[PDB]
Design an enzyme around this catalytic site. Structure first.
Site, PDB file in Angstrom:
ATOM      1  N   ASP A 138      39.310  48.875  44.066  1.00 56.11           N
ATOM      2  CA  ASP A 138      39.883  49.137  45.376  1.00 56.11           C
ATOM      3  C   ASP A 138      39.429  48.070  46.369  1.00 56.11           C
ATOM      4  O   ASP A 138      38.511  47.296  46.090  1.00 56.11           O
ATOM      5  CB  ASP A 138      39.476  50.534  45.858  1.00 56.11           C
ATOM      6  N   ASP A 146      44.480  38.795  44.338  1.00 61.45           N
ATOM      7  CA  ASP A 146      43.079  38.427  44.124  1.00 61.45           C
ATOM      8  C   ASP A 146      42.503  39.090  42.870  1.00 61.45           C
ATOM      9  O   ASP A 146      41.373  39.588  42.872  1.00 61.45           O
ATOM     10  CB  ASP A 146      42.236  38.771  45.362  1.00 61.45           C
ATOM     11  N   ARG A 188      35.507  39.949  39.312  1.00 59.28           N
ATOM     12  CA  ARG A 188      34.740  40.524  40.418  1.00 59.28           C
ATOM     13  C   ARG A 188      35.489  41.657  41.112  1.00 59.28           C
ATOM     14  O   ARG A 188      34.883  42.435  41.856  1.00 59.28           O
ATOM     15  CB  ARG A 188      34.394  39.440  41.447  1.00 59.28           C
ATOM     16  N   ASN A 189      36.797  41.746  40.875  1.00 56.80           N
ATOM     17  CA  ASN A 189      37.598  42.798  41.487  1.00 56.80           C
ATOM     18  C   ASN A 189      38.079  43.864  40.507  1.00 56.80           C
ATOM     19  O   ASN A 189      38.989  44.640  40.800  1.00 56.80           O
ATOM     20  CB  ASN A 189      38.755  42.185  42.284  1.00 56.80           C
TER      21      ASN A 189
END
Length: 308
Positions: A176, A158, A162-163
């Site tokens: 994380d 993913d 946004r991560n």
């Protein structure tokens, strides 16, 4: 392992931190497992009496299994030591609520960060979009964190703006678990009517065969570069999730962003080779841009470390 698996238990170890060494400052936002807070923790960093930290919690209403899964996920990071991956600082598995202490990233996630830049430029002609140099620096930082993870046999599944998280000094790092902002739930689709999948960031083979590898992480990295170059526009804007599935599996590619530097788009195209093995590895990506990275990169990167 599923048929034969590890037990749903957590054994406290050297990562356990006494709740007495922690204090909560304010709410940061709702995470997957519960509210996330900003706070202070004592004795979590060498030669540092106290450290500003992010504190992930588990909702008091969660089941014991969920609290265990939470701790399980945190434990995976106990073996990580990379400047470009948000660091685990400690765990509080005794009492309530269950807590995980993490390195604080004061500027939030990269998607939110990128989108906040547009309104600022619209209000002041003096400001210009991030330079090619700054975009390359972010690219290398993200790629370094991913190369480190891949070297330790981990895939993300993913990877997306946004991560990724932005530190006080603007360094970008792989984020994380359980931190994705609630407003980005729209970035996921119930593919086939099953679990939530980030279809606009998925490789053709992940969409078609359901497989994820370091190669598919590289595909997603290409989309992250596209996000950086577009100040986080939604990929495949004019297509529904179902249309994206077909478009990508059939060989379709995102269009070159307006004003996107040639070298950045060329990197994207390499990350989007239809055949997985033809995509560059994260190490190869870094090697192709290392000459344009800040001098400090040689000192903190996994790329230039003895572990590589």
């Amino acid at each position: 392992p599923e048929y034969f698996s590890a037990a749903d238990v957590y054994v406290p170890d050297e990562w356990e931190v006494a709740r007495e060494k922690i204090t909560m400052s304010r709410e940061l936002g709702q995470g997957s497992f519960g509210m996330v807070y900003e706070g202070v923790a004592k004795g979590v960093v060498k030669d540092e009496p106290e450290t500003r930290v992010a504190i992930k919690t588990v909702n008091e209403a969660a089941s014991m299994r969920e609290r265990i899964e939470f701790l399980n996920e945190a434990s995976v990071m106990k073996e990580f030591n990379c400047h470009h991956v948000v660091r685990l600082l400690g765990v509080v598995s005794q009492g309530q609520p269950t807590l995980v202490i993490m390195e604080l990233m004061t500027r939030g996630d990269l998607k939110s960060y990128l989108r906040s830049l547009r309104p600022a430029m619209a209000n002041n002609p003096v400001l210009a979009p991030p330079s090619l140099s700054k975009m390359i620096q972010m690219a290398g930082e993200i790629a370094d964190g991913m190369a480190y993870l891949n070297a330790n046999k981990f895939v993300h599944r993913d990877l997306a703006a946004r991560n990724c998280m932005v530190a006080e000094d603007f360094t970008v790092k792989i984020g994380d678990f359980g931190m994705t902002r609630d407003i980005y739930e729209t970035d996921y689709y119930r593919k086939g009517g099953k679990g939530l999948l980030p279809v606009r960031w998925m490789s053709p083979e992940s969409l078609k065969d359901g497989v994820f590898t370091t190669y598919s992480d590289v595909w997603s990295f290409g989309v992250v570069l596209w996000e950086i170059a577009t100040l986080a526009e939604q990929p495949y804007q004019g297509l529904s999730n179902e249309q994206v599935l077909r478009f990508v599996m059939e060989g379709g590619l995102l269009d070159k962003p307006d004003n996107c530097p040639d070298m950045l788009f060329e990197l994207m195209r390499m990350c989007w080779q239809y055949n997985p093995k033809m995509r560059p590895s994260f190490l190869e990506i870094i090697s192709s841009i290392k000459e344009e990275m800040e001098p400090g990169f040689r000192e903190v990167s996994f790329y230039y470390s003895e572990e590589n």
